[PDB]
């Protein structure tokens, strides 16, 4: 849809309409991916998120 964003230097979302940020990188869509409850590709997403070290379990653990 219309809302895009890019991250500033302290990790906050900076919302914008424009497809490119002030440093020339592409802006992400603000909205998450569309979900289906009948999705059967859980194995597949874990498989390659593990491979490229971007699964949620492999990130730095949050400070609570």
């Amino acid at each position: 849809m219309f809302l895009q964003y890019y991250l500033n230097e302290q990790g906050d979302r900076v919302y914008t309409l424009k497809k490119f940020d002030p440093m020339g990188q592409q802006t992400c869509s603000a909205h998450p991916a569309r979900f289906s409850p009948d999705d059967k590709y859980s194995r597949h997403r874990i498989t390659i998120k593990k491979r490229f070290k971007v699964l949620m379990t492999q990130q730095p653990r949050p400070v609570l």
């Binding site: 919302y15 914008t16 409850p37 949620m56």
Partner: protein, 353 residues
């Protein structure tokens, strides 16, 4: 290594516990509870919530229905409705965390939306001024439902900000901080009337729900499904323990009152919080104020209403510190240890003798 950690780095409701006022340091510990982060995965989910990033097609009641299929639980609540096409922060409380839903639903929200204007304006400054006009306590007509005309009502907008404006498409991003139950679709209509050109809310996203935001701990519906799958097929809790968080994370703003292990079960059965069982108590407890009562392991026992101030607790030696509002913890998590104390023993002895 816990000995090296400063008390400011202790988790959840035990954070900065040394800066609470100490009534007494002595009690008898009991091997009953756990720290909320180390609850057995079943109990962890039943006392937990999800900071969900809601997708853009389904209704908010459909989303929490999907969560309760996946996790295989009987009860969920959801911190205020997002309309089917709206995304963003939706705190989904699971099972025993549904006792907190009123506190989450009544909390202050934040939104990032797009208003589309129906004719050209002078520039971005003109839209920025119309937003300043619609700050503070505003009139808003609640929409018609089942042909029941709800009356005009007041809702506060704390802050507003004009983030960007595009004169080509006549689109303007706005950020709004506001009271619960504010209609942002209605705000964009009023913003259009005030400019004179007309307008509609093109798009919306909720970026904050009280204590939780999109900045940290937020997860998508795929993570929820994916984490459950990993637990079902490989018996790995790791992913679920990053999707679900314990309900104590929702209560970190409240003033705390730490209780002895003897008192815990009594309070779960519906006893009033008495002063002989208080170990520690926070600065800035007022009368008729909602406080969280916790164990020495940082578990939430109940939401309580304080009948003594901080200063009053310091002077007295007995009596009702607080009454229960809602009990969070189950009965018989801790054993029954009431009636064993000196004055209570003397009472029972002198009745018998």
């Amino acid at each position: 290594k816990v000995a090296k950690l400063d008390t400011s780095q202790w988790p959840l409701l035990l954070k900065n516990f040394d800066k609470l006022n100490v009534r007494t340091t002595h009690y008898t510990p009991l091997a009953c509870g756990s720290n909320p982060l180390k609850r057995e995965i079943g109990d962890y989910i039943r006392t937990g919530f999800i900071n969900l990033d809601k997708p853009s097609n389904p209704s908010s009641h459909e989303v929490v229905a999907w969560i309760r299929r996946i996790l295989r639980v009987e009860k969920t609540g959801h911190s205020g409705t997002l309309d089917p096409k709206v995304t963003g922060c939706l705190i989904v409380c699971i099972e025993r965390a549904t006792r907190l839903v009123k506190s989450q639903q009544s909390a202050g929200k934040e939104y990032v939306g797009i208003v589309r204007l129906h004719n050209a304006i002078e520039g971005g400054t003109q839209l920025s001024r119309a937003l300043e006009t619609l700050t503070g306590a505003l009139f808003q007509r609640p929409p018609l439902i089942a042909a029941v005309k709800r009356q005009l009502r007041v809702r506060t907008i704390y802050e507003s900000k004009m983030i960007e404006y595009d004169p080509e498409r006549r689109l303007g991003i706005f950020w709004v901080s506001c009271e619960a139950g504010t209609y942002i679709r209605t705000l964009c209509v009023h913003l259009g009337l005030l400019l004179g050109v007309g307008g509609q809310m093109q798009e919306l996203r909720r970026v904050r729900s009280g204590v939780m935001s999109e900045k940290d701990h937020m997860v998508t519906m795929h993570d929820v499904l994916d984490a459950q799958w990993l637990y079902d097929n490989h018996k790995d809790e790791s992913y679920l323990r990053r999707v679900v968080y314990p309900l104590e994370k929702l209560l970190t703003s409240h003033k705390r009152l730490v209780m002895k292990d003897s008192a815990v079960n009594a309070i779960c059965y519906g006893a009033k919080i008495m002063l002989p069982g208080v170990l520690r108590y926070e600065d800035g407890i007022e009368v008729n104020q909602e406080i969280v009562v916790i164990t020495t392991k940082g578990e939430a026992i109940c939401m309580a209403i304080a009948l003594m101030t901080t200063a009053v607790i310091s002077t007295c030696d007995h009596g009702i510190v607080a009454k229960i509002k809602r009990v969070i913890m189950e009965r018989d998590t801790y054993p029954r240890k009431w009636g064993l104390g000196p004055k209570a023993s003397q009472k029972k002895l002198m009745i018998k003798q």
